[PDB]
Symmetry: D2
Subunit: 199 residues, 4 copies
């Protein structure tokens, strides 16, 4: 059905000094663009194999489908999770859910930071919503494996810990990047995603 | 177009005493039948998701697509790899390739046996053809991961080491099953698959 | 110090008609016995590699360490999770936690059944305790990957869905085995494991 | 047995302009150093669990052992695979093996480049020696999974395609990094590793 690179909801430098403009521009215009481009190529090749009934070709295409498809899913959410007007704490029912499920907002930040810094290799840290249990949940995903597609949790807030998300600015020091990104979390967007999870 | 369960090319009791009739009937009429049906179900849900551009739904279906699709691929080859007219050693160029790539037929049997008995959990041992290198190659695959779809090798001979392939007759002693199955290998079919790889 | 095969706490035929005596004897005296012995073999080779600083040899041994070590861990819990005095529903705080975290005992049974029947290939379904969140949690594990070692959840109740756990009696119909096993769950043991988690 | 960060066999700027000095210094003094440091911590924790017979703790430590242990193995080989005096083509039996197993030196470069650029996420491209088959073989490894520990192939030449190996200089354009690194391949070292594989 054709996938497209979404416009960034802000200027490439809007998240400075926490994530610099060179990273944002590369991350959106090169990395996410490649995922979209390679996803469209892979989807067309899957339509051919499916019409041909070639199951071997379908299975051979699965790694590229999950990698680029997950990449598209994850980054499309990620851009909306950040804002130049972000930072601080959420309000209302989301903040109450965070206190109820994690103890406090500070304890939640520790848990999500720990999950993000604990990713060995490329991956993502996620705050998600468990619809079956009706409460928040933190999970980590490898490479571009998307949260809902691989675990069923509804994504609320994602932290990209691929090296291209921080290396130009923070080099190997991923914890400095994790501390900085809290200043640009768009809690308005995370609240919207949380409210959508409830009828 | 759909996928269908192939008829077994021989009687359910044709491979006794090496593989008994209760195993052959369950393995074909229950296990393979389930894979083919569930593959068609999974493909239909993927057909819908692909047209809808729902990448999350596509990625969520990948485990079932590889598992049932691989199940169909692997067992369809497996039935042709066995025959009451089987056993012994291959002839002609396949035997020459085995001696060239593995040293001898007996050395090849140990390597394929070792790969099959070495599967921890469910899986398959494979003799394949490496098209890029132009020679034979042995590999092991977990669960129903199909050989060509996951490694690119062209399948020539597969050994199913799922417990349902032997447990009723050999119980926990997988090596006893592996010793017996050499008596029913259809080297005519494996030779046909090998000759198709070279041109 | 070594690891040893624990005696089964009941007769091999004590769980009939739900799990027959041939399965119980093979499962304990053949399968679990193999895991314990091979675990001790693998640990000794790792003991040597660790003292030698041979990291390649250590890493090569990890699949066998997790597989046989998990095999020992999982089955040692499994035997205590079953009893001829089992069946029915738990009492006290465990039942209260089940109702609180899953809605009802019946809803909990479906979720654990769904996780167990959903294992593609060999594996286990688990009811566990999340120490960080302080509540119950269901998870599925592949092959012999143990629950606490791979996810941190404390094991309370495990359902072995390897084919050797049911095939002789129920053949391919894993749901028939899952329905039967609820009749022999030792809720006294699961309650003991749950109460140890809270302090 | 205590692991230590090996000295780099050359100056941090010795591989310029192909890999810049900032990358080499970060790669050796920060990334490899961390692998060594975290490996030593993990090994000490494994000795405690092993003496305690805590198999759960051993299995929980396996990801960090493979990650940091593999990281140490892979980078220790990598530094020796490069040299300011490198580039060009190998001579003697290694060059003959490359021509025999891959067709030509240029075709081999294409195959190893393709394997390296094909790594989705973090990982490594390897030219290895298959001792059982007695010929060269190309393989790719995810994250820090070491070649010999996970596949049995003897490592001859490794290409690190983690983003920290090239991103500061080449950004997202991994193919430009792969083309440049051929100018500093230490074929003297690769030849030594190849000759050691033969009696
Ligand atoms: Mn990214
Ligand atoms: Mn089968
Ligand atoms: Mn078992
Ligand atoms: Mn590196």
């Amino acid at each position: 059905m054709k996938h497209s690179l979404p416009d960034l909801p802000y200027d490439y430098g809007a998240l400075e000094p926490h994530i610099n403009a060179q990273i944002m521009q590369l991350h959106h215009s090169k990395h996410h663009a490649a995922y979209v481009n390679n996803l469209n190529v892979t989807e067309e090749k899957y339509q051919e194999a499916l019409a041909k009934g070639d199951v071997t070709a379908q299975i051979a295409l699965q790694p590229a489908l999950k990698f680029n498809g997950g990449g598209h899913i994850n980054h499309s959410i990620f851009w909306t999770n950040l804002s130049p007007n972000g930072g601080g704490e959420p309000k209302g029912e989301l903040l109450e859910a965070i206190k109820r499920d994690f103890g406090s907002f500070d304890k939640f930040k520790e848990k999500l930071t720990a999950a993000s810094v604990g990713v060995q290799g490329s991956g993502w840290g996620w705050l998600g919503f468990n619809k079956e249990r009706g409460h928040l949940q933190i999970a980590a995903c490898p490479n571009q494996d998307p949260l809902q597609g691989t675990t069923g949790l509804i994504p609320l807030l994602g932290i990209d810990v691929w090296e291209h998300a921080y290396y130009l600015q923070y080099k190997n020091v991923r914890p400095d990047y994790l501390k900085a990104i809290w200043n640009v979390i768009n809690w308005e967007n995370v609240t919207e995603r949380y409210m959508a999870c409830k009828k």
